[PDB]
Design a protein around this motif. Sequence first.
Motif, PDB file in Angstrom:
ATOM      1  N   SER A   1      48.379 -51.385 -52.447  1.00 45.64           N
ATOM      2  CA  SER A   1      47.354 -51.127 -51.492  1.00 45.64           C
ATOM      3  C   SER A   1      47.773 -50.397 -50.419  1.00 45.64           C
ATOM      4  CB  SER A   1      46.558 -52.312 -51.083  1.00 45.64           C
ATOM      5  OG  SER A   1      46.095 -52.955 -51.972  1.00 45.64           O
ATOM      6  N   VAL A   2      46.847 -49.429 -49.976  1.00 49.00           N
ATOM      7  CA  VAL A   2      47.421 -48.625 -48.548  1.00 49.00           C
ATOM      8  C   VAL A   2      46.029 -48.922 -47.876  1.00 49.00           C
ATOM      9  CG1 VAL A   2      47.693 -46.512 -47.523  1.00 49.00           C
ATOM     10  CG2 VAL A   2      48.594 -47.149 -49.930  1.00 49.00           C
ATOM     11  N   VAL A   3      46.161 -49.504 -46.637  1.00 55.55           N
ATOM     12  CA  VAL A   3      45.033 -49.685 -45.571  1.00 55.55           C
ATOM     13  C   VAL A   3      45.122 -48.744 -44.518  1.00 55.55           C
ATOM     14  CG1 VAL A   3      43.782 -51.166 -44.336  1.00 55.55           C
ATOM     15  CG2 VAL A   3      44.732 -52.069 -46.746  1.00 55.55           C
ATOM     16  N   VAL A   4      44.347 -47.918 -44.184  1.00 52.68           N
ATOM     17  CA  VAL A   4      44.362 -46.995 -43.167  1.00 52.68           C
ATOM     18  C   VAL A   4      43.161 -47.340 -42.230  1.00 52.68           C
ATOM     19  CG1 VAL A   4      44.218 -44.626 -42.381  1.00 52.68           C
ATOM     20  CG2 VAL A   4      45.332 -45.147 -44.290  1.00 52.68           C
ATOM     21  N   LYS A   5      43.511 -47.502 -40.881  1.00 52.76           N
ATOM     22  CA  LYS A   5      42.558 -47.826 -39.746  1.00 52.76           C
ATOM     23  C   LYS A   5      42.577 -46.650 -38.821  1.00 52.76           C
ATOM     24  CE  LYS A   5      43.106 -52.592 -40.419  1.00 52.76           C
ATOM     25  NZ  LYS A   5      43.239 -54.179 -39.810  1.00 52.76           N
ATOM     26  N   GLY A   6      41.604 -46.204 -38.337  1.00 56.54           N
ATOM     27  CA  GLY A   6      41.598 -45.319 -37.339  1.00 56.54           C
ATOM     28  C   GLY A   6      40.205 -44.721 -36.922  1.00 56.54           C
ATOM     29  N   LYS A   7      40.093 -43.616 -36.442  1.00 55.76           N
ATOM     30  CA  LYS A   7      38.700 -42.824 -36.199  1.00 55.76           C
ATOM     31  C   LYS A   7      38.872 -41.539 -35.966  1.00 55.76           C
ATOM     32  CE  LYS A   7      38.763 -43.722 -31.005  1.00 55.76           C
ATOM     33  NZ  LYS A   7      38.098 -44.602 -29.865  1.00 55.76           N
ATOM     34  N   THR A   8      37.929 -40.700 -36.276  1.00 55.58           N
ATOM     35  CA  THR A   8      37.942 -39.250 -35.934  1.00 55.58           C
ATOM     36  C   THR A   8      37.781 -39.057 -34.412  1.00 55.58           C
ATOM     37  OG1 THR A   8      35.646 -38.691 -36.057  1.00 55.58           O
ATOM     38  CG2 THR A   8      36.662 -39.053 -38.123  1.00 55.58           C
ATOM     39  N   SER A   9      38.160 -37.875 -34.095  1.00 56.96           N
ATOM     40  CA  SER A   9      37.935 -37.276 -32.704  1.00 56.96           C
ATOM     41  C   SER A   9      36.954 -36.418 -32.641  1.00 56.96           C
ATOM     42  CB  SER A   9      39.547 -36.317 -32.225  1.00 56.96           C
ATOM     43  OG  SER A   9      39.369 -35.181 -32.916  1.00 56.96           O
ATOM     44  N   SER A  10      36.426 -35.777 -33.710  1.00 56.55           N
ATOM     45  CA  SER A  10      35.470 -34.774 -33.585  1.00 56.55           C
ATOM     46  C   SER A  10      34.160 -35.350 -34.326  1.00 56.55           C
ATOM     47  CB  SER A  10      35.702 -33.656 -34.242  1.00 56.55           C
ATOM     48  OG  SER A  10      34.560 -32.480 -34.315  1.00 56.55           O
ATOM     49  N   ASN A  11      33.038 -34.983 -34.227  1.00 57.48           N
ATOM     50  CA  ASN A  11      31.861 -35.101 -34.948  1.00 57.48           C
ATOM     51  C   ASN A  11      31.604 -34.502 -36.296  1.00 57.48           C
ATOM     52  OD1 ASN A  11      30.630 -37.253 -33.549  1.00 57.48           O
ATOM     53  ND2 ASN A  11      29.941 -35.684 -32.025  1.00 57.48           N
ATOM     54  N   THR A  12      32.569 -33.338 -36.364  1.00 58.18           N
ATOM     55  CA  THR A  12      32.307 -32.570 -37.378  1.00 58.18           C
ATOM     56  C   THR A  12      33.380 -31.818 -38.052  1.00 58.18           C
ATOM     57  OG1 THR A  12      32.063 -30.552 -35.961  1.00 58.18           O
ATOM     58  CG2 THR A  12      30.231 -31.664 -36.406  1.00 58.18           C
ATOM     59  N   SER A  13      34.673 -32.423 -37.863  1.00 53.52           N
ATOM     60  CA  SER A  13      35.902 -31.860 -38.760  1.00 53.52           C
ATOM     61  C   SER A  13      35.983 -32.725 -39.854  1.00 53.52           C
ATOM     62  CB  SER A  13      36.944 -32.079 -37.597  1.00 53.52           C
ATOM     63  OG  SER A  13      38.065 -31.496 -38.257  1.00 53.52           O
TER      64      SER A  13
ATOM     65  N   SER B   1      45.222 -45.942 -36.073  1.00 54.12           N
ATOM     66  CA  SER B   1      45.534 -47.041 -35.037  1.00 54.12           C
ATOM     67  C   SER B   1      46.435 -48.076 -36.241  1.00 54.12           C
ATOM     68  CB  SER B   1      44.411 -48.104 -34.937  1.00 54.12           C
ATOM     69  OG  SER B   1      43.717 -48.270 -35.834  1.00 54.12           O
ATOM     70  N   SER B   2      46.342 -47.950 -37.733  1.00 52.37           N
ATOM     71  CA  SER B   2      47.227 -48.932 -38.352  1.00 52.37           C
ATOM     72  C   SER B   2      47.385 -48.067 -39.833  1.00 52.37           C
ATOM     73  CB  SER B   2      46.517 -50.167 -38.457  1.00 52.37           C
ATOM     74  OG  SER B   2      47.331 -51.105 -39.418  1.00 52.37           O
ATOM     75  N   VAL B   3      48.446 -48.306 -40.339  1.00 49.32           N
ATOM     76  CA  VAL B   3      48.664 -47.912 -41.695  1.00 49.32           C
ATOM     77  C   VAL B   3      49.573 -49.135 -42.340  1.00 49.32           C
ATOM     78  CG1 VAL B   3      49.905 -46.557 -43.521  1.00 49.32           C
ATOM     79  CG2 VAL B   3      48.794 -45.521 -41.397  1.00 49.32           C
ATOM     80  N   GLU B   4      48.947 -49.985 -43.509  1.00 52.87           N
ATOM     81  CA  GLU B   4      49.490 -51.073 -44.172  1.00 52.87           C
ATOM     82  C   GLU B   4      49.789 -50.477 -45.532  1.00 52.87           C
ATOM     83  OE1 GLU B   4      49.357 -55.779 -45.102  1.00 52.87           O
ATOM     84  OE2 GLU B   4      47.638 -54.811 -43.943  1.00 52.87           O
ATOM     85  N   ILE B   5      50.899 -50.476 -46.290  1.00 50.09           N
ATOM     86  CA  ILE B   5      51.194 -50.339 -47.572  1.00 50.09           C
ATOM     87  C   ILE B   5      51.716 -51.748 -48.146  1.00 50.09           C
ATOM     88  CG2 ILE B   5      52.753 -48.953 -48.998  1.00 50.09           C
ATOM     89  CD1 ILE B   5      52.653 -46.707 -46.865  1.00 50.09           C
ATOM     90  N   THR B   6      51.094 -52.228 -49.161  1.00 48.75           N
ATOM     91  CA  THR B   6      51.417 -53.570 -49.560  1.00 48.75           C
ATOM     92  C   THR B   6      51.443 -53.592 -50.975  1.00 48.75           C
ATOM     93  OG1 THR B   6      50.556 -54.762 -47.656  1.00 48.75           O
ATOM     94  CG2 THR B   6      50.767 -56.015 -49.517  1.00 48.75           C
ATOM     95  N   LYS B   7      52.430 -54.114 -51.742  1.00 51.21           N
ATOM     96  CA  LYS B   7      52.569 -54.579 -53.203  1.00 51.21           C
ATOM     97  C   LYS B   7      51.824 -55.499 -53.679  1.00 51.21           C
ATOM     98  CE  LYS B   7      56.803 -54.603 -54.698  1.00 51.21           C
ATOM     99  NZ  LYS B   7      58.181 -55.193 -54.822  1.00 51.21           N
ATOM    100  N   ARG B   8      50.984 -55.258 -54.827  1.00 55.11           N
ATOM    101  CA  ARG B   8      50.209 -56.378 -55.175  1.00 55.11           C
ATOM    102  C   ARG B   8      51.205 -57.432 -56.006  1.00 55.11           C
ATOM    103  NH1 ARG B   8      44.142 -56.482 -57.284  1.00 55.11           N
ATOM    104  NH2 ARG B   8      44.294 -56.069 -54.942  1.00 55.11           N
ATOM    105  N   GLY B   9      50.919 -58.638 -55.459  1.00 59.23           N
ATOM    106  CA  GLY B   9      51.998 -59.745 -55.923  1.00 59.23           C
ATOM    107  C   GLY B   9      51.930 -60.006 -57.459  1.00 59.23           C
ATOM    108  N   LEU B  10      50.753 -60.118 -58.065  1.00 59.55           N
ATOM    109  CA  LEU B  10      50.479 -60.520 -59.511  1.00 59.55           C
ATOM    110  C   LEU B  10      49.669 -59.167 -60.219  1.00 59.55           C
ATOM    111  CD1 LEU B  10      49.433 -64.284 -59.234  1.00 59.55           C
ATOM    112  CD2 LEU B  10      51.523 -63.285 -59.443  1.00 59.55           C
ATOM    113  N   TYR B  11      50.187 -58.430 -60.575  1.00 59.84           N
ATOM    114  CA  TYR B  11      49.915 -57.079 -61.076  1.00 59.84           C
ATOM    115  C   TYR B  11      49.680 -57.009 -62.570  1.00 59.84           C
ATOM    116  CZ  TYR B  11      49.384 -52.218 -62.312  1.00 59.84           C
ATOM    117  OH  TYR B  11      48.783 -50.854 -62.832  1.00 59.84           O
TER     118      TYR B  11
END
Lengths: 137, 138
Positions: free
Chosen positions: B17-29, B128-138
């Motif tokens: 899993s990759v979890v990305v948190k953040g926000k854009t700086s512009s309304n139209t980019s 504001s955050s990036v999380e990279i996590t291995k799924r335990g029971l794949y």
Amino acid sequence: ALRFEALYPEGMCPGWSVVVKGKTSSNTSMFEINFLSHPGDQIAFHFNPRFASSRIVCNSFLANHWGKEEVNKTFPFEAKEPFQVEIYSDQDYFHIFIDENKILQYKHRQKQLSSITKLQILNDIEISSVEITKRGL
Amino acid sequence: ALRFEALYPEGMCPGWSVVVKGKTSSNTSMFEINFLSHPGDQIAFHFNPRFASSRIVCNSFLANHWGKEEVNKTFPFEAKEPFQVEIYSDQDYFHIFIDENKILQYKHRQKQLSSITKLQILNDIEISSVEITKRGLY
């Protein structure tokens, strides 16, 4: 052996928490977590648990050489058992928490904290998670 | 410009899993999250929220060209406001969520999943955050 590297060009110091979860396969090996600065990939902070001697060695690799080692005898790691290392930097130190307990602080030698853009994890660690999160707000 | 890149040489696909948190700086980019394969940093999966038209484009660069664009039917993102995007891979798809609610799935076109070793984040996203996590029971 490089196990993980992250690059954040805007700078991940100070004000960012880094949480590394995983386990070490061998009771005689070692791993390291390094924070590197641009340019030149200098090591601002090297965090190196050594399982053979049950010590944490910390240092910096600046001007192409190591400085004085800071050796910590608090060793909250056991081979093959999952652990969680949390690292945070403020204006003056890197702070290390392991399994939620404070372990050590390391005073900054590289003062250009905002040039610290790379996180590198090497050697005997089977990573289950890396989380990098902005906290200095 | 490059905002974030992570490299996990053992392959971060499938079962991560990759979890990305953040926000854009512009309304139209726009911003993008790319999963890159070794060797050559090849674009196995490209996820591109585009705020000017309010469309999400997904694609891959394989066999020397961009493939057929998959344009999502909805656009749940709001500019200049924090969001949390999760991408998870299994044997068949990349699964994409916003606020833990599934948005879309993208069928793997690059079959060498184990060669996907890099996560790259470009353009208009203040992370504001990036999380990279291995799924335990794949």
